[model samples]
Target: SQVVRIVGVGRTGIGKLHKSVDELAASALKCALVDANMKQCDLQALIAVPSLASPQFMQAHHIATVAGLFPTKGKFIVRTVDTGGAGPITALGMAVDLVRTRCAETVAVIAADAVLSMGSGAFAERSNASLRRSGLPEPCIPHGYDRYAQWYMSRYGLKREQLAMVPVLMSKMAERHPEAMCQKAYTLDEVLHSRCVAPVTNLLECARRADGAVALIVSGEAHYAEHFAGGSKPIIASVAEASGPLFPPIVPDIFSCRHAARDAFLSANLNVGDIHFFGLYDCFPICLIQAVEAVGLCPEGKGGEFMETAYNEMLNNGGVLDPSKFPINTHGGLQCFGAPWEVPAMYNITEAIAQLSEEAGDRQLTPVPKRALVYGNGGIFSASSVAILISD
Candidate 1:
C-alpha cells in the first residue's frame, strides 16, 4: 500500500449550531478544501457518515448533492459509511484505503449531525424508538454504561472521588479549548454533587448530544508532490478496526477497543509508549479510563489509578496538564466537547491533525507530538476503530 496523508482538516463548534446537517457538513468541507489549497472540483471522491438524527439529509448522496460535491466533469466516488459512533474513523479508514489503492488521489471525508437542533426530547424519542425496535427492553434508560461503571468501581475498589476526577480534569481541559461546548471548569466536589443520570454516571460525566460537523482532506504522496507542498503533514500510519457484541458484554473488558488498538499499533510498528498524544473516544468518563487500559497505556484494571495520578498532577499544575505528561483528549474529549452523533470522533482526528501540524493554538502540546493514536467506539462497545497518525 502507498502512503496516505491527511492534508487538511476543519470543524464547526459543538452545541446548538442551528444549521441543517448538510449545511454544517458543507461549511466544514469548504474550510478543509481551502486549507488543502484545493477546490471541490479537485476531489475525486467524497466519503461521508450518515446522520442519526436528521432524516431529511441522512444519506451520503444527499449530502454530496447539497454540498456541491456531485456533478463533477469526470468520474467521482461518493458513498456513505456507518459504524454507529465509530463512523468518522471508519469513513477515514475507507478514504485511506481508496488513496492507498490509487483508486482516488484525493478524497474528502465529512460527518455532521443535528442532534441538538432536533431538540433533546425529540432526539431521545427517536433514539429510544430505534432502540426498542432493536430489542432493548427499556428504550429511555442508559443503564449499560451505569452498569459498567458500577462493575468497574467494585472490581477495582475505586472510590467515587477517583471517578469524579475524570470530569474535573476534562472540564479544565475544555476551558482552554475555544470551540468546546462545556468550557466552565468544575471542581471535584461539584462533579461529585452533579445530578446522577445513572447509578454511577453523573450529569457532568456523560457527553451531551449536540449539533456539529467536521471534514478532512486525504491524499496520497503523488498528489502532495504535484501540489508543491513543503510544509509538514500528518501521515496515516495505520488504521484498523474490530468489533464485539452489540450490547455491552457482561464481562468487564472492552474487547473491541483492545483488539483494534493492538492491531493498529502492530501495523504502525509502534506501541502505547511511543504515542505522545491520544484522542480516545470518551462518551463517558469511564469510557476514557477503559480505553486507556484497553490501548495498553496502563496495566489492565489500573486505569482508575492512572487517572488518579493524572488528576493529582493537573491539580498540582494549577488546573492545567503538564506538557510532559501523557495528553489524552487535548481537544477536551466528548464529555466536554459535546457529542454530535457520528461526528465527535472526527473532532478527535482533527484535533490530532492540529497538534501534529502545529496548528492547535492555545491547547497545543509543547514539544509538538510526533505520533498520535485516535480510537473511536460505537454502540455499547460493539464497534471500534483505531488510527495511528504521525508527523511527516
Candidate 2:
C-alpha cells in the first residue's frame, strides 16, 4: 500500500546443525537489526523460508523468539517446496506489503544451509523436498542432479577454464574477506583442475556446506528514520521475481535476469552501467556465469571473461580489465561464504547489504559502493529474484 525504501538493516553469518540454525539466525538477526538501529522492535516479523536441504522448522521459530519477536506477533513461514530458492524473496515482497498496509513495520527475511549434516543424500534430499513436479526434457530425460550443467556446457560452448573462473574470482575476493570460511587464492588452472562434482561442477565450484544464517531488516519507506536512522541507506530500488519450467533449462536463461534488471533501471529511471557493485548467486560455476551474463556484464557465453574484466582487478591480478573496477562476491560468495541453509538465496542478499554499507569488516569493498545489484535463484534453474539497490 506504500512505497518502501530499504532504510537500515543487519545480517548474521551462516550457522549449521553442527552449529545450529537457531544460532546462525540469531547472529544474522542481531546484525541486521542493530545495523538498522531500530532496537525497539515491537513489530518485527519473520519469514523463515528454511532451506529445503536442512532441518530448520524448530530452529526458525525458536530463533524468531530469541531475535525478540513474539512468535504469534509475526508470521513465521517456511516452504515445503523443493529447491525453493525464490521463496524468501517472495516472502520479502509480502513483508513489504505488510508494512505498506500498516500491519507491521519491521521484518527480517532469513535462510541457511547445513547440508554438511545430510552428507551424500544432502543435494538430492533437498532437491526432492524443495523442487516441484517437473516435466520431461527433450533429447533425453534429465537426471535431477547435474544434467543442467552438462546442457549449459554443451549448448553455451562453456569451456572448463571459463567455468572455473567464478571460484577463482570468488577465491580471490575471499582472500580479502576476513569473515569468509577459507580464503586461499586459486588460479584458473587450480580451479579448472579441481575435483569435478557433476559434469562441469567441481568440488571447488560447489559451495561447501557450512553452518550459518542470513538476515536483513526491512521497512516501508514511510518509516525510514524511525526504523533505519543512521544506519546505511541501501535503497531497494526494485524487487522482481520470475521462474520457468521444472527441469533444468535448455539455455539456463541469463536473459531473464537482464530483463528484470532492465525493468529495475526503467522503473527507477537509472542505468545498469552506473551501478557500483554486484552480488550474483553462484551455487555452481555455471550458475554464476549465467547470472553475470544475464546482467550484461559480458556476452552470453563470456561470463568468465566478464569475471576477468569486470571484477575488481587489483584483487584479481592483472586481467584484460583494470583493477579499479567494482568488486563481485567480495564475501567469496556461497563458494567460500559457507552455506548453513538456502545459502545462495540469503547470502547474496546479506552480502549486497554489507558491500553497499561498507560494514563488512575485511571483506568491505574499497572506494566503497554506492549502488548494488543482487540476484537470487531458486529451484533447479527455475525462479529468479532480482533487485537493484542504491546507497542507503
Write one digit per residue (lDDT tens) for candidate 2, span 59-173: 4565566656653534433222333556556666666666767766766666655566556465555544444455432211114335765666677666666667777777767
| Candidate 2 ranges with C-alpha deviation above 4 Å | 1-3, 15-17, 39-41, 53-68, 71-83, 117-146, 227-231, 249-255, 308-323, 360-366
Worst 10 residues of 2 by lDDT: 136-145
Candidate with the greatest lDDT versus the true structure: 1
All candidates: TM-score:
0.94, 0.81
- Over the stretch 1-392, how does candidate 1's per-residue lDDT look in tens digits? 78788887877777897898888988998888888888888888888887867865448788889777667888789888878778888988999999877788899898889998898788878766644433444432355666667788888876677677887777777788887888798888888898877777788887778899888989997777787362246888999999876665466555679888999999999999888889989887777888998999898788888888988888788777764585888777888878887789987787887787787888888888899999998876778989999986
RMSD of 1: 2.0
Worst 10 residues of 1 by lDDT: 132-141
- Assess candidate 2 and give its lDDT: 0.62
Candidate 1's displacement at residue 306, Å, is 1.0
